Structure formats: C-alpha cells, structure tokens
Amino acid sequence: NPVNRLSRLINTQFWNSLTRRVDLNNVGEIAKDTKIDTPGAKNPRIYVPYDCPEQYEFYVQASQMHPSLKLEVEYLPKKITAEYVKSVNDTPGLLALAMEEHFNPSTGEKTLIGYPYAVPGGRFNELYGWDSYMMALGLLEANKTDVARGMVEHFIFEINHYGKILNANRSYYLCRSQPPFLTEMALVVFKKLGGRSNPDAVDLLKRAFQASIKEYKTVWTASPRLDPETGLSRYHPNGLGIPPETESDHFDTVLLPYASKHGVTLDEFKQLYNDGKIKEPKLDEFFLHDRGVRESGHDTTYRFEGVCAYLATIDLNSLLYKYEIDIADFIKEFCDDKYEDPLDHSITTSAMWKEMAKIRQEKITKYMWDDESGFFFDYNTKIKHRTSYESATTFWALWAGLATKEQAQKMVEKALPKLEMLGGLAACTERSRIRQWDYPFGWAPHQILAWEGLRSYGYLTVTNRLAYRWLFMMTKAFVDYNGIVVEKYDVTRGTDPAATEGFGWVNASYILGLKYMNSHARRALGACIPPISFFSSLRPQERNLYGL
Ligand SMILES: OC[C@H]1O[C@H](O[C@H]2O[C@H](CO)[C@@H](O)[C@H](O)[C@H]2O)[C@H](O)[C@@H](O)[C@@H]1O
C-alpha cells in the first residue's frame, strides 16, 4: 500500500537521511556547501562566536584529526557588522550551533557533541528557520523528539549569539532571518517531553521563551523592521551588497542597465558595487527588497519582488500575534505573572502582552482585513496603502487566532474558493498573479498552517477536504514517479514524465495530513482515487465530514 510505503519511508529512512549531528569526524561532511562557488569555498570553514572557547577547541581539534579536510576555524567579532559579512562573502563558512555536554561517568572527562537537527535536504545542508517548525512537527509524530528538541536548543543559541533566528547558519545569512515559530515550536516540544512533569522540559520551555521574548523585542519589534506609525513589523534585513549564495547569472539582468549607465563591464560593476564604490540609491533599495523577500521565505513571488520591504505582511504580523499570546501564557504560569527581562530590566505582565496582542489584532484588521473579498491583504507602510494581491497566507490569521469568528467564516466562504485547487491550496489566486511561490503552486507550509488554523476555528471538515486533496496529489506522484518526492507541486495539474531523503516539510506535510484521515480515506488514497471520485462515492452524511 503506497500510503503505508511512503509513510514508512518518511518516518525512518527519510528523517535519518536529513538528520545531522556534529561530532569530530563528520565535520566538513556537515560543512559542505555547494551553493557558493568561489576560491574560499574550496576548503571547509566554520565560524565561532567569541563567547565559546570550548567550541573553538572542539572544531579546531577536529581540523587536527583529519587534515585531509583542510578545515579552517575562525572566531567571530563580538559585533557583527553588515560590512563584516560582506567581507566573508568570498570566504564563507558554517556557523557553530548549540552543543550538548556529555560527561564521562567514571573519569568525569567532558566531551562536547552537537545537538541533532534536520536539514531541508539536497542543496540545503543547514538548519533553516521556518522549515524547522514544519519538520519538528513531523519528527514528533515519528517519535524522534531529540531531533526536534535539538533545533529548539539551536534557535536559543542562534538568538543569544547571533542576535536572531537565522535564515540558516552560514556566514552569508548572519544578517537575515525567517518567520518566527519559536514559541509554538517550544510548546509542542514541551508537551511531548511530558510537560511540567519533566524538569528538563520546563527548563527548556523557560530558556526558549526567554529567547523568544528577546527575539520579539530586539528583532521583530525593533527598527528597521518595526514601522512606528502603524506599529506593525516588516521584513527589513540589514544585509549589505549582493547576496553571494544565488546564481552567478541570477541578478545579471537587473544589473546590466546600471553597468551600462556607469560605462563598465558588468563583472567590474559587480566588484565595484561590492566594494562600495558605486552609490546607486534605486539599486540599493532593490537589493534591500530582495533580502526582505528572502527573509519572508517566499522567494520568489510577485507580491514581494520589487514590493516587500515597506510591506507589513499578514504573514509576519500573524506569527507575532501568536508570539504575544504564547509569551503572555508563559509569564502567567511559570513567571508568576511578573517577568523582568535580565537584559534591559523591563518588567512585564501577561495582562500587558495580552493587551499588545489586542492592539495588533485591531491594527491588522484596520490596515489589512477586507470584508468584501474576505482576504487579509498586506499594508504598504511607505505609500500608506493596502495591497490587492490575494495570498494563501491569509489563513495564518486563523493559525494565530487573531481573527474574529465573523471574519473566519466570511474568509472560508469568500476567500477559500479562489485558493482551493485540485491539489489543495494554491499560494495565491490566479487573478492576483512563472514565479516560484505564486499560482499554480501549492506549498507544504501553506497547507500545514491552514489545516491547523481551520481546525482551531471549528472547521475540520474543510481541513479533511483540503488534506485529502493534498495527500492524494502527493500519493499519485509517489507512485507515478516511482518513489520520487518532489519539492514543488502544481495543485492545478497532474503528473509528468536524490529523492531518497524527500524534502523536509513536504515529508512532514504528508504525515500531519494523514492524521486527519480516517481508515476509509486512507484506503481510498492507496487506490489513488481522485478527490472528485472519492467524494461523490460517499454517503451524504459521510460526505459532510469533508464539508460537502
Ligand atoms: O536561492 C537560494 C535561497 O534558498 C533558500 O530559500 C529557499 O530554501 C528554504 C529552505 O528550503 C525555504 O525556507 C525557502 O522558502 C526557499 O525559498 C534561502 O532561504 C534563501 O535565503 C536563499 O537565497
């Protein structure tokens, strides 16, 4: 049965293939980076913060065992400047992450070994920000918790030492980030470890919310990201120059007009721009929006390219609402409703946080919600106007819990039909739109968040329907492509003419979706029954379970 075959592969072979753990021997296997080709990328390299002498010894000694790798270890400055990262552009490296202390019981000798984590797979050998929530959900269903806990330990380390949750842990990501899930990601691992019963669980919960509170204040509600007028946050990374990790050809088309304006060859224009010599304001802004699109994880989409820096997205501000609610709960329970940030000595109560979320919910509705169309749009903070682009991320409002019941149903009735395709939810409506993250492409995170969001607001029959559509499409591809799991899916079309690891959040979308399926539906999936045929075959009251 292909449903059980795919599931079984995801739970065992796939996650193991994607799992990474740093020991002394595997460095340079973990440090492999194909995305940046340049003379500095030939030898493996790791960067370490100035706070971690013990980690420095670990990796330094790692180079001493296997000089074959020619691995180079380098400390990092206490203050990491945008200019500084531009300097390591041509000499990249992997960033150290959380380490687990393991003591010899007889002789007490302490050895360091990395916490486990999952990579998205393939070209991406690093821990990524918003993939890791998706994967951790799937790993907790596969009952590998240590892999999920490791990533939480990593996000904590990322926030303290690197100042935010990184797009991924590499030199060239140090100014970027990605949509925050840390609060909810901490809760689901807390509950799996046994909750308050487990003292290690409670410890972890506190450290993750301590870090979450700092990420909130110092990153997302700080400037430049925070818009003072609206009080809503935008994606505004401080990265400088042209991002190294793209294709050498990638930007050549937009750069070429500027080079001709400056009368030099493009390859010279590239170098002189990265040397700061050319000052072009209009182009400096473009690359600013580019880095903002890469911080949104949606690179690339038409609602963003040339648009989103100034944009306050339903995406980010929804996940912030979840942060504010989660933080409030944490303080009221474990902090006795009094929390004083040890950094700035700021006292806060749950009532205050619960307040802050109420204002956010008000201001989101003010600047975003549209009752006629049923969508949450994004607000441009520069020109002070609302976007017309209909996006699938509007369901994050449900996932966060900031929408009113009235908003939700108007959104289910009016908004959902335009996003619901054969394979589930397209990333945006056809009218709103060949880019990557636009129609006709569905993406796993969009599905996962909408499933749980729709469930919280009381529609799980819609989730059953949308999950069937997605799992059917994934199952048919598994059998038609002979075990190949593909990263991207066209939800409006059918099949076509190393997948041993799959792709992390696609794997997780499959299992998370199957929880919503009863045994009748799982069997229909094994037969590769299309949704139209499956639904029409059900007794009318069973068909109600799918919202039909
Ligand atoms: O072209 C390089 C870009 O790759 C990443 O973005 C993709 O990979 C991530 C992990 O799969 C996803 O979270 C993301 O949604 C994808 O768009 C990276 O995030 C970008 O910064 C790179 O520029």
mmCIF file of N, CA, C and O and ligand atoms in Angstrom, residues 35 120-121 124 126 128-131 167-168 172-173 176-179 243 245-247 250 290-291 293-300 436-437 443 445 487 503 505, ligand 1:
data_model
loop_
_atom_site.group_PDB
_atom_site.id
_atom_site.type_symbol
_atom_site.label_atom_id
_atom_site.label_comp_id
_atom_site.label_asym_id
_atom_site.label_seq_id
_atom_site.Cartn_x
_atom_site.Cartn_y
_atom_site.Cartn_z
ATOM 1 N N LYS A 35 26.435 25.830 -2.567
ATOM 2 C CA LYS A 35 25.686 26.985 -3.036
ATOM 3 C C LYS A 35 26.567 28.173 -3.370
ATOM 4 O O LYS A 35 26.131 29.066 -4.103
ATOM 5 N N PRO A 120 16.705 20.799 5.371
ATOM 6 C CA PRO A 120 15.633 20.609 4.388
ATOM 7 C C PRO A 120 15.959 19.544 3.370
ATOM 8 O O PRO A 120 15.047 18.926 2.811
ATOM 9 N N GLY A 121 17.234 19.293 3.134
ATOM 10 C CA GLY A 121 17.683 18.286 2.201
ATOM 11 C C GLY A 121 18.311 18.896 0.962
ATOM 12 O O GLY A 121 18.156 20.081 0.660
ATOM 13 N N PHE A 124 20.533 22.249 0.468
ATOM 14 C CA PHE A 124 20.494 22.980 1.723
ATOM 15 C C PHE A 124 20.949 22.048 2.829
ATOM 16 O O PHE A 124 20.181 21.214 3.309
ATOM 17 N N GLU A 126 21.910 23.035 5.857
ATOM 18 C CA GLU A 126 21.922 23.787 7.100
ATOM 19 C C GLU A 126 20.549 23.819 7.750
ATOM 20 O O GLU A 126 19.524 23.573 7.120
ATOM 21 N N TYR A 128 17.453 25.616 8.892
ATOM 22 C CA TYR A 128 16.741 26.781 8.403
ATOM 23 C C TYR A 128 15.635 27.148 9.368
ATOM 24 O O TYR A 128 15.158 26.314 10.138
ATOM 25 N N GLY A 129 15.263 28.415 9.347
ATOM 26 C CA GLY A 129 14.330 28.896 10.331
ATOM 27 C C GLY A 129 12.925 28.362 10.213
ATOM 28 O O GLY A 129 12.468 27.646 11.100
ATOM 29 N N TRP A 130 12.232 28.629 9.126
ATOM 30 C CA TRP A 130 10.828 28.266 9.163
ATOM 31 C C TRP A 130 10.565 26.851 8.688
ATOM 32 O O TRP A 130 9.512 26.296 8.996
ATOM 33 N N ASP A 131 11.512 26.234 8.002
ATOM 34 C CA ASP A 131 11.371 24.820 7.721
ATOM 35 C C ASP A 131 11.327 24.022 9.001
ATOM 36 O O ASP A 131 10.601 23.032 9.085
ATOM 37 N N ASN A 167 18.227 32.765 8.877
ATOM 38 C CA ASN A 167 17.728 32.070 7.703
ATOM 39 C C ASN A 167 18.288 30.661 7.655
ATOM 40 O O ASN A 167 17.561 29.698 7.422
ATOM 41 N N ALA A 168 19.593 30.537 7.843
ATOM 42 C CA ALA A 168 20.278 29.274 8.060
ATOM 43 C C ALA A 168 21.610 29.632 8.683
ATOM 44 O O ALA A 168 22.026 30.787 8.642
ATOM 45 N N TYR A 172 26.824 33.895 5.273
ATOM 46 C CA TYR A 172 26.100 34.855 4.452
ATOM 47 C C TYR A 172 24.657 35.041 4.869
ATOM 48 O O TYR A 172 23.949 35.822 4.232
ATOM 49 N N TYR A 173 24.193 34.331 5.885
ATOM 50 C CA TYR A 173 22.855 34.527 6.423
ATOM 51 C C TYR A 173 22.824 35.364 7.695
ATOM 52 O O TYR A 173 21.743 35.596 8.234
ATOM 53 N N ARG A 176 20.245 37.957 8.006
ATOM 54 C CA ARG A 176 18.891 37.597 7.622
ATOM 55 C C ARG A 176 18.237 36.739 8.703
ATOM 56 O O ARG A 176 18.849 36.345 9.694
ATOM 57 N N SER A 177 16.972 36.418 8.478
ATOM 58 C CA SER A 177 16.148 35.677 9.415
ATOM 59 C C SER A 177 15.057 34.991 8.605
ATOM 60 O O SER A 177 15.210 34.786 7.395
ATOM 61 N N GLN A 178 13.970 34.627 9.263
ATOM 62 C CA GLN A 178 12.876 33.890 8.644
ATOM 63 C C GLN A 178 11.727 33.852 9.634
ATOM 64 O O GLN A 178 11.932 34.104 10.819
ATOM 65 N N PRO A 179 10.511 33.576 9.167
ATOM 66 C CA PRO A 179 9.328 33.761 10.012
ATOM 67 C C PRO A 179 9.456 33.014 11.328
ATOM 68 O O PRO A 179 9.885 31.856 11.349
ATOM 69 N N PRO A 243 23.712 39.330 -2.515
ATOM 70 C CA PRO A 243 23.805 38.067 -1.793
ATOM 71 C C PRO A 243 24.656 37.067 -2.546
ATOM 72 O O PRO A 243 24.445 36.823 -3.741
ATOM 73 N N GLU A 245 24.905 33.774 -2.265
ATOM 74 C CA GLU A 245 24.503 32.389 -2.416
ATOM 75 C C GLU A 245 23.616 32.151 -3.628
ATOM 76 O O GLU A 245 23.224 31.007 -3.870
ATOM 77 N N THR A 246 23.292 33.178 -4.396
ATOM 78 C CA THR A 246 22.440 32.981 -5.555
ATOM 79 C C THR A 246 23.282 32.499 -6.724
ATOM 80 O O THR A 246 24.458 32.160 -6.586
ATOM 81 N N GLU A 247 22.669 32.459 -7.896
ATOM 82 C CA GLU A 247 23.372 32.094 -9.107
ATOM 83 C C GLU A 247 24.223 33.255 -9.592
ATOM 84 O O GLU A 247 23.844 34.421 -9.475
ATOM 85 N N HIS A 250 22.211 35.205 -11.715
ATOM 86 C CA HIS A 250 20.859 35.474 -11.243
ATOM 87 C C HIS A 250 20.481 36.930 -11.451
ATOM 88 O O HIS A 250 19.467 37.239 -12.081
ATOM 89 N N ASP A 290 15.021 42.608 -2.067
ATOM 90 C CA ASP A 290 15.424 41.236 -2.321
ATOM 91 C C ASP A 290 15.681 40.496 -1.019
ATOM 92 O O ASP A 290 15.145 39.409 -0.798
ATOM 93 N N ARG A 291 16.495 41.079 -0.137
ATOM 94 C CA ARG A 291 16.781 40.428 1.134
ATOM 95 C C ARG A 291 15.523 40.284 1.977
ATOM 96 O O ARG A 291 15.398 39.327 2.747
ATOM 97 N N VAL A 293 12.539 39.679 0.712
ATOM 98 C CA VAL A 293 11.830 38.536 0.164
ATOM 99 C C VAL A 293 12.454 37.244 0.655
ATOM 100 O O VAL A 293 11.753 36.281 0.975
ATOM 101 N N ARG A 294 13.775 37.205 0.751
ATOM 102 C CA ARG A 294 14.416 36.007 1.258
ATOM 103 C C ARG A 294 14.207 35.839 2.751
ATOM 104 O O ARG A 294 14.304 34.722 3.250
ATOM 105 N N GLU A 295 13.914 36.912 3.477
ATOM 106 C CA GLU A 295 13.602 36.767 4.893
ATOM 107 C C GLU A 295 12.186 36.276 5.108
ATOM 108 O O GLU A 295 11.893 35.703 6.154
ATOM 109 N N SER A 296 11.312 36.489 4.140
ATOM 110 C CA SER A 296 9.947 36.014 4.209
ATOM 111 C C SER A 296 9.820 34.553 3.823
ATOM 112 O O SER A 296 8.727 33.998 3.921
ATOM 113 N N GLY A 297 10.890 33.934 3.350
ATOM 114 C CA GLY A 297 10.845 32.561 2.915
ATOM 115 C C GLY A 297 10.101 32.329 1.630
ATOM 116 O O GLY A 297 10.126 31.211 1.117
ATOM 117 N N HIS A 298 9.451 33.346 1.091
ATOM 118 C CA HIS A 298 8.619 33.226 -0.092
ATOM 119 C C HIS A 298 9.359 33.520 -1.378
ATOM 120 O O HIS A 298 8.716 33.692 -2.413
ATOM 121 N N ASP A 299 10.674 33.655 -1.332
ATOM 122 C CA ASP A 299 11.419 33.926 -2.546
ATOM 123 C C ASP A 299 11.237 32.793 -3.547
ATOM 124 O O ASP A 299 11.523 31.642 -3.241
ATOM 125 N N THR A 300 10.751 33.125 -4.740
ATOM 126 C CA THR A 300 10.290 34.476 -5.052
ATOM 127 C C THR A 300 8.819 34.478 -5.427
ATOM 128 O O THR A 300 8.298 33.484 -5.922
ATOM 129 N N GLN A 436 7.909 31.524 -8.561
ATOM 130 C CA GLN A 436 8.036 30.305 -7.772
ATOM 131 C C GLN A 436 6.881 30.148 -6.791
ATOM 132 O O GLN A 436 6.137 29.166 -6.845
ATOM 133 N N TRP A 437 6.727 31.099 -5.886
ATOM 134 C CA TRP A 437 5.777 30.980 -4.796
ATOM 135 C C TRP A 437 4.390 31.480 -5.144
ATOM 136 O O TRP A 437 3.602 31.729 -4.238
ATOM 137 N N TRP A 443 2.269 24.923 -1.520
ATOM 138 C CA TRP A 443 3.455 24.672 -0.734
ATOM 139 C C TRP A 443 3.048 24.070 0.593
ATOM 140 O O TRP A 443 1.979 24.377 1.116
ATOM 141 N N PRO A 445 4.119 24.398 3.846
ATOM 142 C CA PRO A 445 3.786 25.243 4.994
ATOM 143 C C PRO A 445 2.441 25.910 4.857
ATOM 144 O O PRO A 445 1.715 26.034 5.845
ATOM 145 N N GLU A 487 9.910 18.632 -4.552
ATOM 146 C CA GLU A 487 9.873 19.778 -3.655
ATOM 147 C C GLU A 487 8.643 20.635 -3.903
ATOM 148 O O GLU A 487 7.964 21.048 -2.961
ATOM 149 N N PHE A 503 11.887 15.877 0.807
ATOM 150 C CA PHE A 503 12.120 17.267 1.163
ATOM 151 C C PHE A 503 11.401 17.541 2.470
ATOM 152 O O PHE A 503 10.212 17.253 2.594
ATOM 153 N N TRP A 505 9.805 19.624 4.709
ATOM 154 C CA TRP A 505 8.460 19.991 5.120
ATOM 155 C C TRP A 505 7.399 19.383 4.230
ATOM 156 O O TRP A 505 6.218 19.427 4.579
HETATM 157 O O1 LIG B 1 18.235 30.598 -3.869
HETATM 158 C C1 LIG B 1 18.755 30.394 -2.540
HETATM 159 C C2 LIG B 1 17.678 30.652 -1.499
HETATM 160 O O2 LIG B 1 17.291 29.375 -0.878
HETATM 161 C C3 LIG B 1 16.542 29.488 0.428
HETATM 162 O O3 LIG B 1 15.184 29.697 0.210
HETATM 163 C C4 LIG B 1 14.539 28.534 -0.120
HETATM 164 O O4 LIG B 1 15.004 27.438 0.774
HETATM 165 C C5 LIG B 1 14.449 27.422 2.135
HETATM 166 C C6 LIG B 1 14.627 26.056 2.667
HETATM 167 O O5 LIG B 1 14.058 25.181 1.706
HETATM 168 C C7 LIG B 1 12.967 27.737 2.190
HETATM 169 O O6 LIG B 1 12.612 28.092 3.533
HETATM 170 C C8 LIG B 1 12.636 28.903 1.379
HETATM 171 O O7 LIG B 1 11.192 29.084 1.457
HETATM 172 C C9 LIG B 1 13.031 28.720 -0.019
HETATM 173 O O8 LIG B 1 12.601 29.882 -0.716
HETATM 174 C C10 LIG B 1 17.025 30.581 1.351
HETATM 175 O O9 LIG B 1 16.014 30.814 2.334
HETATM 176 C C11 LIG B 1 17.247 31.845 0.615
HETATM 177 O O10 LIG B 1 17.778 32.850 1.527
HETATM 178 C C12 LIG B 1 18.227 31.632 -0.472
HETATM 179 O O11 LIG B 1 18.504 32.914 -1.093
#
